[PDB]
Structure formats: C-alpha cells, structure tokens
Amino acid sequence: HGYITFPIARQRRCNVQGGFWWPPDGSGIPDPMCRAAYQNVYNKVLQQGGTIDQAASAAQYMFQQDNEYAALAGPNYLDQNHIRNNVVPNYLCAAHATTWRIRPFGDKTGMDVSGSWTPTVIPLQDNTVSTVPIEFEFCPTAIHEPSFFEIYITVPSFNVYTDQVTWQQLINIFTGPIPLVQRRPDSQCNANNLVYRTTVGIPVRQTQFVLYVRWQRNDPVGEGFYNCADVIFAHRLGINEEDKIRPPKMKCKGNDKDCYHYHKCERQYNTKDFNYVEWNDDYSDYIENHTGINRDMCDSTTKCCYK
C-alpha cells in the first residue's frame, strides 16, 4: 500500500486537504475538483437508492483509501494486454474501482472526472529545456518486495479539463524496480522510515499534464497500485536569452545622468503617458462583448419593427 508523495497524487492531495468528514455531502471540501469527485460518488449512491450514510460512506471511502488505489492482476501481471483490457481497462485514476457496494475496492470513479485538478507547479529556469529531471517519491505505507514501478506521461494532446486518462494517451518513461531507501528529513512521506525515490527526465509540456504511476508486486496475487499525478511547468518571464542583444561596454558622461543564503518571499503597468488600469478594464469589456456565441453583432446599431 502507498501513494505518490512527489509529485503528490490526485487522491493523496484530496485526502490530506480534508473537509470531507463533515458535512456528509462534501460541501466542506475547499478544492473544487476534490469536491466534485466526492459529490459524484455521493450523488451516484443517492441515485442508486443508497441512504445519506451509505453515500457519505462510499465518498469518504474513496478519499480515506488513498494508499489503496489498487487492482488485482493475478499471476499474469507482466501481460500488458491483460492489464489494459482486464485489470485497469478504464477509470485509470480510480485504479478501476467502480462498485460502491463491494469493498475492496469500492467506487473511486469520482477521481476520474475531468476539470481544473490542482497541479504541482514546477518552475522553468530556462524555457528551452527539452526535459526536466523530477525526483519521484513514492510513499509505501506497507512494505512489499519483490515489486516494480511503471511511470507514464500523458501525450501532448491530452486536455485534463475534458479528457479521461486512457492507456492510448500514456507514454511510458520509466519501467523497472526502484530500491527502498531511507526517507530524507524533508520527506513528504510520513508512514515509516522507507520511501521509493527515482529520477526521471520528464518531457517538457506546454500544458497541464498527468503522470501515471503503477507500483506492481511480483507475486501470484498480483496487486498493483495505480495513481494519477497532476503537474504543470511554469514558464520563466522575460525575453528568451538566446534573442537578447547586449550593449557594448561603454563609459559615458554629461549633465543629464538619465541619458546613460535566504531569498525573497497592475498600477505597476501605468506610466506617465498612459493609464493602463482604465484602458484594460475597457479592454476586458471589449473581450466579453465581442468574443463568443453571444457577442454583440447588430443589436447595438440595428433597430427593427414588425410591419
């Protein structure tokens, strides 16, 4: 049993943020996607004749069981067609848990809804880099060996706002065993002394993307843990350095001088010759009145009457 602590898995973040224990309808969950996830399972059970308690039980079970986003593969766990067609054919972020009445693995399908899932924001120091090394940290709440990991990235055409994660959309970037190592004092995992850590060069994405992590046990039961991790690269601001023309080393003079281990934690855009704040509020109204299917076309200039 376990989950991704870095980059934090989708269900791990929903669990740690809380607000899901009470009120039972999940209205106390601050993150909107964690809330939708919860309320989808809650409303599903309500539709299927479950009581408020069975509905709040099924939804809280999805959040609480963040170390058990699992599926059993059996002894045939290396058979890729059996994983993709039988073990986890769909509901990948839920590790294919679709039955609220049956535990394990209950119903975790709420974790597969699409929308503005909160990502791990990784900043870019150079916007031209092809890959970004990420040191993954998988938190084992229960120690299991022998085992192996599989790390996937979504294809560049994936859209987290509208799409469900599918195998046809995932690119394998890591396959193999990850040895168990002692957690660092700064570890995001607080279960036991051990973690799984590995460095993966993550292909740079210009959009929010998903990292798929499968932790598979090499054993006849074939239990595997499947977790989705929402990530985004933040671009560096300013000119791309490779285009920056630097001035020659110069020494100037004249009566007018304007002629020549801790870090830091819109009226700035106004100048003496332009009021940006006023213009940009009018420019925002322009965007609203002149974009979309309901934009102004003729009504502001055309009058009509029935003959």
Q: Which of residues 130-189 bind Cu ion (CB under 5 A)?
A: 142
**Phi/psi-derived region of residue 278, left when phi > 0, alpha when psi is between -120 and 50, beta in every other case:** alpha
Size of interface with a second copy, in residues (CB under 8 A): 93
DSSP helix/strand/coil, 255:
coil
Report the C-alpha gap between 25 and 42 in whole angstroms.
7
Report the C-alpha gap between 296 and 289 in whole angstroms.
6
Q: Which of residues 66-105 bind a second copy (CB under 8 A)?
A: none
Shortest distance (Å) from residue 261 CB to Cu ion: 7
Q: Which of residues 124-153 bind a second copy (CB under 8 A)?
A: 125, 127-128, 132-135, 137
Instruction: Decide whether 52 or 78 has the Cβ nearer to a second copy.
Output: 52
Instruction: Decide whether 45 or 83 has the Cβ nearer to a second copy.
Output: 45
By CB under 8 A, tell whether 184 contacts a second copy: yes
In this structure, are residues 184 and 137 in contact, taking their beta carbons and an 8 Å threshold? no
Among 75, 104, 115, 203, which residue interacts with a second copy (rule: CB under 8 A)?
115
Size of interface with Cu ion, in residues (CB under 5 A): 2
By CB under 8 A, tell whether 51 contacts a second copy: no
DSSP helix/strand/coil, 170:
strand
The residue at minimum Cβ distance from Cu ion is 1
β-partners of residue 6 are 137
Instruction: Decide whether 250 or 304 has the Cβ nearer to a second copy.
Output: 250
In this structure, are residues 71 and 6 in contact, taking their beta carbons and an 8 Å threshold? no
In this structure, are residues 143 and 12 in contact, taking their beta carbons and an 8 Å threshold? no
Q: Which of residues 209-268 bind a second copy (CB under 8 A)?
A: 235-240, 243-248, 250, 252, 258-260, 268
Shortest distance (Å) from residue 283 CB to a second copy: 7
Instruction: Decide whether 81 or 182 has the Cβ nearer to a second copy.
Output: 182
By CB under 5 A, tell whether 1 contacts Cu ion: yes
In this structure, are residues 115 and 208 in contact, taking their beta carbons and an 8 Å threshold? no
Number of residues that this document lists for the chain: 307
What is the β-pairing status of strands 223-234 and 120-123? parallel
Residues near Cu ion, by CB under 5 A: 1, 142
